[PDB]
C-alpha cells in the first residue's frame, strides 16, 4: 500500500526524531518499491553515518553515484565517510567535488561544505 515517496517521507520524519535505524529501514522499503532512485541510498547512507556504520554508508554512496553522478550529498557523505576512516586525500577531493557540484547546481548549504573541508584538511595535517 505505501508508495516509495510515502516511505521516504516517513524515513525523513524518523530521521527528524533521531530514529536512524528505523529511518534507514523505511528507505530500504522505498528501495524495495523503486531501487532506481539515488536519493533513497543517499538518505540511508546518512542514517548509517549517524550510526557510525561507515562501510554500509560507503556502499550506499556508491549505489547512489551509479544512479546520479551529479549527486552533491552522495559525494559529501562519501567524503565524510572516508574522513572518519582516515582517508583524507580522497575525502577532501569528494568534499571539493560536492562544493563544485552545489555551485554548478545553485544549491545553498551555507558554510557546511567549506567547514567540512577545513575539518578534513586540519585532521589530515594533525596526522601530517
Amino acid at each position: 500500500s505505501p508508495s516509495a515517496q510515502e516511505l521516504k517521507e516517513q524515513g525523513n520524519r524518523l530521521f527528524v526524531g533521531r530514529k536512524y535505524p528505523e529511518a534507514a529501514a523505511c528507505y530500504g522499503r522505498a528501495i524495495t518499491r523503486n531501487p532506481l532512485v539515488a536519493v533513497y541510498y543517499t538518505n540511508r547512507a546518512l542514517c548509517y553515518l549517524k550510526m557510525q556504520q561507515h562501510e554500509q554508508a560507503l556502499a550506499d554512496c556508491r549505489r547512489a553515484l551509479e544512479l546520479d553522478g551529479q549527486s552533491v550529498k552522495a559525494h559529501f557523505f562519501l567524503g565524510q565517510c572516508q574522513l572518519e576512516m582516515e582517508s583524507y586525500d580522497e575525502a577532501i577531493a569528494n568534499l571539493q567535488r560536492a562544493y563544485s557540484l552545489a555551485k554548478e547546481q545553485r544549491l545553498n548549504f551555507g558554510d557546511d561544505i567549506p567547514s567540512a573541508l577545513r575539518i578534513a584538511k586540519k585532521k589530515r595535517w594533525n596526522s601530517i
Binding site: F15, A23, L46, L49, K73, R106, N108, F109, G110
Partner: peptide
C-alpha cells in the same frame, strides 16, 4: 535560495 543543512535527507 534558502540555506539548508547538508546533513539532512532529501
Amino acid at each position: 535560495l534558502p540555506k539548508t543543512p547538508i546533513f539532512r535527507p532529501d
